[PDB]
């Protein structure tokens, strides 16, 4: 499926793909998330 191209035409967009590439979670952030593991009022 890593080579499936036509399946991406109905699933993603080039700008969305660039956003996904930029904002992918790095290893250190997952390590930190595993290591660590708002009342509204109408003013």
Dihedral of CA 5/11/13/17: which sign?
Answer: negative
Told to check if 36 binds other proteins by CB under 8 A, we report yes
Count of alpha carbons within 13 angstroms of residue 20, beta-carbon side = 7
Told to check if 15 binds other proteins by CB under 8 A, we report yes
CA gap 22, 6 in Å, rounded = 23
Told to check if 20 binds other proteins by CB under 8 A, we report yes
Choose which of 2, 3, 14, 28 interacts with other proteins (CB under 8 A).
Answer: 14
Interface contacts to other proteins, rule CB under 8 A: 1, 5-6, 9, 13-16, 19-20, 23-25, 29-30, 33-34, 36-43
């Amino acid at each position: 499926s890593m080579f499936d191209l036509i399946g991406l035409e109905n699933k993603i967009t080039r700008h969305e793909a660039e956003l996904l590439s930029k904002k992918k979670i790095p290893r250190k952030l997952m390590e930190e998330i595993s290591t660590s593991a708002p009342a509204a009022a109408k003013l």
